[PDB]
Amino acid sequence: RGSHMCDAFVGTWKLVSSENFDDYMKEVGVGFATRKVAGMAKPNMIISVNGDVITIKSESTFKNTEISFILGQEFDEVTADDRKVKSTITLDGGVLVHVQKWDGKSTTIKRKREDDKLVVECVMKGVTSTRVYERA
Template sequence: MSVFVSISPHTSLPLPEADDITNSRCKSSQSDHSRTAELTPPNSSATLSPLSAALPSHSNLHSFLLLSAAKMAEAFVGTWNLKNSEKFDDYMKELGVPFATRTVGNMTKPTTIISVEGDTVTVKTQSTIKNTEVNFKLEQEFDETTADGRSVKSLVRIQDGKLVHVQKWDGKETSLVREVNGNALTLVNTQAIVIMFVKFPN
């Protein structure tokens, strides 16, 4: 049965019954719920904001930073031949290298080959006496056995455009700083050794 409300002496409009109002509200609620379900991804307990969805995960960000650092190391890529060195014998004495080994070391003309593959840097040193190879990721500590037989903990990073290589062993520490200027690569360390390399085929 409908209820009529008088608006003017000559006009009256029907009002919906209480049951009709309740049914209408239920249908509206169900419709809103359906629209929400359509916008929510399946198997999702929460809706991410567009900004959150666009941000890389921690592991992806770490990988991106490693690759970016390795990209900067590409300035050092190449084959480098020894041109001259200063105070190398003093450096070996400081490290405790025996006289016979120092004599051979002073006569050696090593070639250094630096390459980058993904986030990994490889440094090879080749000579008529001994060949060495070390592979590492920038900003990550690694174990290294040096040409003179020391077992060290090493860490390499790019700093002010220079390749800084820090070695620690038995409470001691030394750093090897490589810098490229054109076709020349200079290697300097904390003991003031200066070694100059030139890029092959110069």
């Protein structure tokens, strides 16, 4: 019950830049209207740890959601775009790797600290979106 290295992710984060998000979304299969409304949002992301359980929440004009999970242990997740997926989050040397699977597809969201930023890379097949957060 002392420090985690994940206690580098802990806190409150605000989105400060987005690249290629619409394309990432299209590749995922997100509908037009949802893409438009989601891409406008400037969420905060709140990350906390309590023993082995990591919680990530979004505070967003698009959708307020939360996930709680244990590294390496699969869980059910209903995404903001209303996909029902099976997810697993692991820590691969400093990077939090979030894999979502549904209908024989998958997408990977990687989150890592760089300088004072938390960089989120969303990947679907060959399309990558980079979403950059700073401390709130």
